[model samples]
Target: QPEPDMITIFIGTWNMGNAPPPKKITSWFLSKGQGKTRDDSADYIPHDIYVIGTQEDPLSEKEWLEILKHSLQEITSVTFKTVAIHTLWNIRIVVLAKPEHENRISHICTDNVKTGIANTLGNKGAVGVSFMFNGTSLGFVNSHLTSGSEKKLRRNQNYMNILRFLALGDKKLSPFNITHRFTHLFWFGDLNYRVDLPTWEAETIIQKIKQQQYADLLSHDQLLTERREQKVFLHFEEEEITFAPTYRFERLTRDKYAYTKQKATGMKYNLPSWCDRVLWKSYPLVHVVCQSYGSTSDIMTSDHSPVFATFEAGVTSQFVSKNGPGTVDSQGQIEFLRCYATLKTKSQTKFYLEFHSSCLESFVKSQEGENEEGSEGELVVKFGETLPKLKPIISDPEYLLDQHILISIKSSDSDESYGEGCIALRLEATETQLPIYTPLTHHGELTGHFQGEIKLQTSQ
Candidate 1:
């Protein structure tokens, strides 16, 4: 069975509108006030991964990214380094990972598209990164689509276009088809699908939000409508949104709808909508649990409020063996086998044991590689004239190579004798890595470790 591991992830999206980030952006991860507080204890813990997507010129500035990185490091126990950072015109996305896991990440890929004018302008597009984590593949995409309530078709087209072009090198490298290239994926950004309602109609629905009738307004969300009719985000999963809309708010505070000013200036102002969003999907082997989702009203310096989410994603160790011990190849691939030998003590007078075809070779290596022999622990042991009750010690301080094995020989207690211990011990065996899997030989011998995953227990 593969051991279960967890990685906490923080996903955030915003449209910074060319504004510089605050000097103390700490609350992005740890907000202390009501309606913004994190509900999980893990939130207090450092994040393993941070996926940030922004739409607007501000995020394109290098200083903003540096400010974010510095603030994040101050709040977490460990330092986070940018693994992948990219920008597509006004849309930018950055992924940062905790330092230790950085070396295990590889095969990073990125791509972008412009769908603003004739699908060639830079105002609308998506940028993404795909990388390998341990033995699992993972991907992330940040996008900004066409604006306006009637641009759903353009938005969906851009969605399909992102999958077709994003890559590290060539399209051939993206042959897994982007979406299926990774075992897990996260897609987020300012999707720009406005509410399909008149001004008064949209505000009426917002008023009913307190009565839990927000679903009525959400049912009219252009993105939701396009996703249903056009199959826009086929396999993605989004959390139930109970928070107010994340777009079209005032640039100074959370109160006014600056968008209302647009209507006064004579252009039609689209109704407010949840434009900033984070959605995800994973293969059956990978599980992602959403812990929190809401928009922040604290930093109201932008027309679009920032939305954030926290999640716990399952990470499985692929190299671990369940049946017994075995060593992985250079590529970290292993084939485990059942224990070939098992010995049980009957009052320790002698060991009753059975050996498989490979047991002999396995036993030789275990002893030769054990601690006394410079390895973790002795895999096989060969006894002398008498069996002593010896306490076994683990070889490596940080590695699990061998178990402590003890044995004693006695004949009915009263009939016990010393050198009359006539024992046949032809212990010529290969010194190999077998402690974790195969059992040790009788008399006194230690075998392999690591190549197998077993802890042998014996009693006298």
Candidate 2:
């Protein structure tokens, strides 16, 4: 099956405190968490992707990552597979997707750095992972930044440390840096950013939070303030925090804070805050609209609650190709394409291609060099099928791959020749003087061909 035109992604972060988890994380994850209204549909519709972050946990604890991933699978029935899991000490992060999407999610890579001690120890820092989603290259970082309100500067520094030390891909030590080279970015974890108010003042605002009057309080939110100053998360943006603070909370008490311990002394240094958070960065190719961003109040495994965010991403072909805007590029315009070769019958080989292309010849030519070589390439087959559009064609036709190609090969080999005569098959574009390139080829430069091989066998 071709990859989905739009993917719904659910991203979350939790601080587990080494406590035994529930059979799963529960309704907040399976349901819409804080986003949906009672009037909204209660029926569950699972997201296509999940990028989860965990703190104070084990990567080897029964493959805990699988527990969360499979919990999603059991709840949603969408077979999920971990794309990558990167951990630094207790900070862990995992990216997951439907099993049918391995090809769409490729080039899995990870990197991490420790701000624990001289940048070598693991107790604190960030873990990063990157992959190509469909055709769009994306990056995710789950971090446990420095704690405390006075440590906001240190949090900013920790963020910079991750940006400077953490990287993605092979070679280049880090092929994709945190700030660039990806169409979209998802960053989450226990950022430990505190509210800038004293406990007394913050509590005054906290009382009004239920009234939905949090605008003034947000002005003092450490993370939001830093973003306003471009002090950290320079390119990232977080949705408005509709749900209450996620940090310094008590276990089991849904609305109370860990303030009981703080209240024993003075409220001076211990102010309530929204620490666990998720935010995203966008590039020319991908723009994400946050559908929901809030904490799940019921899962009380730790002092810090989990934060979940739902995002809808719009990916442009150019973004997927890592090629900036040129509506029609002869190089590679279609990013989400699927091609399959199989034996329809003992003597018949068939090829099925799903794509959206403006110029069929040029698109075929682009894939020509990738096809198998030999008798398969030499065998003549007609392109006599045009699959109806599975979805609306959005890009310009010259650059869009908008159809399916079904080609069949009927063996012409002599059956009496032997116990078995074998032939391999391949596909290529026929040369045409099409003005597809407009100018780069000056209407005459020969495009590349599918360069590979195939296997075919026939017996008496």
Candidate 3:
């Protein structure tokens, strides 16, 4: 039987609208099972990681960090440490992990992209944090897009710009795209997509919210419409919004939406919308289950309610061997190779291997004088005796020949390149393939050696 460990992660996003941190923010943390204990309720469990993203934050970076640290400590018995924090203008993202898992987390990196005027300003953009938890890679992004009732196309452009420019890890070793670098990615913040209908129709539908008619209002949501048309957030998934619209709320009010009429035209100015949202995507092999998704209404300092999601993220640590170690079933559909490496580095320095794979056609075409080549695959392995099993999923078995796997060794501290090497796969193999040593070179100088052995197996 295959067994995997699971960790609970809490993600929260809010558009502060330049509001200061409130004094009693504990409710926000405890509302979504973050600080809950098993004794309190049958399903209550503390979260292993807490990721908070905000837009238009009023406080300084240091002050916001302090407030979050203190607020979490005051509500939970478990000690939480701030793992990563990044702020770009008014957009900010902070990560906190339990002390027990702190040692297991590594390769923490932060990046941002500006989508403001001429893509040169920070007023509207995205800030992200990428890190390795256990063996699984995860990324959290906080973004603020263009705001206006009629700027749907502008918001789509902003999404594309962020995806094109946000680089998480060493660009020399990993993919330049954020979605390609991580196993699981969570994107949340003020997307600012407004309602499609006019002011009168949207306000009318919102009134039915108290009667639980969210579907009526959601039918005219710009974000959902664009997503249905495959224009934005292509493969990302969001939980069903059971609550009311989170944006255009009156400041300091519990549930009142901001719907003031303009005396000049005698028409409502602010149309309620679901501007704040949380969305996530993960690899096919990895599993991420959302346990709860909702918004907090009691803390009403900001015009937008705080949206939060809790998930049980799966971690695949050990290789699944159907027939004992170094063996395979006859009808194995998937194959994985376990790589090992030994490198010479400074004392106490750690390193990881970034793997990129290409099919036989692309590999041969690239070798035949092509400037841009290789459909890059995403896989990061730590340098150790027994690294995680690297699974390269190829559609056609005929393309196995000439397929190359490139491995780049990078420092965990600075993400600097140490060395890199490549391996070619063969179609026919015995039950056990002996380990072959490949020399790793950096700047044309020898740096280390890599050894890999493939153990094929089939699942019944």
* Most accurate candidate by TM-score: 3
Model 2 is weakest, by summed lDDT over 10 consecutive residues, at 435-444
Query: Model 3, range 306-383, lDDT digits (tens) per residue?
Result: 887778887634222334233422333323345545555443445655666422111110111111211342122333
Candidate lDDT scores, in order, read 0.56, 0.57, 0.67
TM-score (all chains, Cα) for each model: 0.65, 0.65, 0.69
**What lDDT does candidate 1 reach at residue 15?**
87
Model 1 worst lDDT run, 10 consecutive residues: 418-427
What's the lDDT for candidate 2? 0.57
lDDT of candidate 3 at residue 221, scale 0 to 100: 88
* Tens digits of per-residue lDDT for model 1, 1-460: 3333678778888888768665565666663322334755644487778888888856544776687788787887667888888887778878889887776677777777666555447588888877766545678888888777766787877777776566632243211345444556788889888778877675575566545456777888877776667357765688877777777776777765545536543576757787877888665335678877877767766788778877888663433333223431121111112322222322333221211111011211111111112243322223221211122221121111111111122233333311100111111211221233222221112222222222222211
RMSD of each: 19.4, 17.5, 12.5
Error of 2 at 193 (Å): 1.0
Least lDDT summed over 10 consecutive residues: which range in candidate 3? 361-370
Candidate closest to the true structure, highest lDDT: 3
Rank the models by TM-score, top first: 3, 2, 1
Give the per-residue lDDT of model 2 (tens digit) for 418-438: 010111111122121111100
State the displacement of the C-alpha of residue 317, model 3, in Å, after optimal TM-score superposition: 3.1
